[PDB]
Amino acid sequence: MVAVALGGLASGLEIGESITFKPLRVSSLDQIYESIDLDELNENGIISIEFVRNRTNTF
Amino acid sequence: TRPHASISEKVFCLIGQAEGGEPNTVYELRNYSQAKRLFRSGELLDAIELAWGSNPNYTAGRILAMRIEDAKPASAEIGGLKITSKIYGNVANNIQVGLEKNTLSDSLRLRVIFQDDRFNEVYDNIGNIFTIKYKGEEANATFSVEHDEETQKASRLVLKVGDQEVKSYDLTGGAYDYTNAIITDINQLPDFEAKLSPFGDKNLESSKLDKIENANIKDKAVYVKAVFGDLEKQTAYNGIVSFEQLKTIEPFELTKLKGGTNGEPPATWADKLDKFAHEGGYYIVPLSSKQSVHAEVASFVKERSDAGEPMRAIVGGGFNESKEQLFGRQASLSNPRVSLVANSGTFVMDDGRKNHVPAYMVAVALGGLASGLEIGESITFKPLRVSSLDQIYESIDLDELNENGIISIEFVRNRTNTFFRIVDDVTTFNDKSDPVKAEMAVGEANDFLVSELKVQLEDQFIGTRTINTSASIIKDFIQSYLGRKKRDNEIQDFPAEDVQVIVEGNEARISMTVYPIRSFKKISVSLVYKQ
Amino acid sequence: QSYLGRKKRDNEIQDFPAEDVQVIVEGNEARISMTVYPIRSFKKISVSLVYKQ
Amino acid sequence: TRPHASISEKVFCLIGQAEGGEPNTVYELRNYSQA
Amino acid sequence: ERSDAGEPMRAIVGGGFNESKEQLFGRQASLSNPRVSLVANSGTFVMDDGRKNHVPAY
Q: What highest taxon heads this organism's lineage (chain D) (predicted)?
């Protein structure tokens, strides 16, 4: 269903506009992965999601 | 009378031996009434109120706390019910629960007792959902309720005059999901009547009715009971205790719950301390004592910062630990993002009791103060509001501690007043040549500024619109950002002309200079008398 | 070349060689080869912040 | 996290006793971090 | 019927004299549709008649 959400986002983007760094609007992610883990996933061609807590906001 | 009247961005973390509430789960705190509701006793309850009572002016913001224990709830299996306490720990054993029968109403009665809270409640008229009565002139009339023997859910309610069924209410599912439809339809029959129980809108799901057969109606208003569903209705969202049905429910004597446990002291902290890895706290102080805690916390903080999450820890060694011990702890703790507090003392507290306070709890107080300061504002010379300090140290001793990177507290008796002020915010990192590492406030400002610059660069450029975003544009964006920060006085000054960007392919390598806010620390006066 | 010019005007492509399109036709068949430069995305930045004074 | 953010025409020659890098090969320099 | 016909209307009702909760619940169950408000209490009105009226919940 996260892949469903990603497909709903990508279909809404402009043609040729990337989902790269776009917001996902997921509530909480059962995430094991940190920076090196994200590198391992992405280098293998596996899309990964990163939680970012900004100074005053979360996305 | 339902409508009535009755009568800081730097989030801070605490972890240690709390003696109340479910452990292994992070709690977000805003007021100590919430703390007493959950953390009944132990060092965490003191630590929270100390953080919010840290300073006359400053205070900690929302606190993230976890009880680190292997506690479990007291529980009992008796009658047809399994009884579990909501409280976690040894205290849960004091809870006593018992079922009785109210003979006047042919219904169950429940009582729960917990003397520590002075909590004592009775629940009454349990069961007795609705009555059925009959008025036809035939000799007799009866009803029956039957279950599905596998799920024990009610499947039919049947009304029988004499030997034969007049009508049956199919409770497996449909128009009769709720009992009120059954009441209305029984009332629709000319020869039958039904009336809801006067004791509240019981209004139970009809699948939770109980097995009854051949109850004679003509001379009696006979109650359908449905005791377990009424128990759930009256107690599911209430009380200290919860119930689960294994069997038949029957009265049992008032019984203590058993098995309430706190668990052993934990041998390791990583698998529980790592739960803070996304809670968003900046400062953390462990209430526990052992050096293994300091090592694991330092490793955790270092991993988080290497993962891009800024964190810093404040620590303090025991009671009256001389300089020789403190130096060994410092040598075992010399990485940055850990601050060592030398002193221990006493806190006047709202408990009335004068607490005897270890240096760990002094470090708690210092973390509560620092989280309340402005971003980049130093704890240097700020009041601590400690009552009395078990202090060996004088001026040269303070120099020895501070030069070693060990935070020290000095008692100062002014001409007419007394206060305790902390001399400096030096971190445990020894080498003073780089104040980002040596000094905590500079590091905090660096972490926040860097994180903001990271985010703004992400939004502006790692949106990946084009490679044509040449180096000069990146230079302009940098200079505008530093200009804004100078306008905000978040930085003292930056070279306008000495920012350079080189871009090749998808990569831009950037170098910049910033002048940090230069603090002013020392004064010496040579007073001379003449004439 | 007119099609690629239109697409450059629409910014659907970054650029194409104007002079390096070739066509060979024989009978009913035309074999065509062309080059197009895709939109080059920009992905990484590294900052070396230095404090002084 | 591979895509991420982390934190004059008169060309001039120098030759002499440097104490680093492979010798006997010319290097073209642009910034002293490279040096 | 009026509201289904597009005309907004609401009624206010109140049961008798000193009707206990058991009676009122039965009246409520017989009157549970919206646009009807049930008043529980009855009392007395000082009035310009001079007579103290004994006042039903109606």
A: Viruses
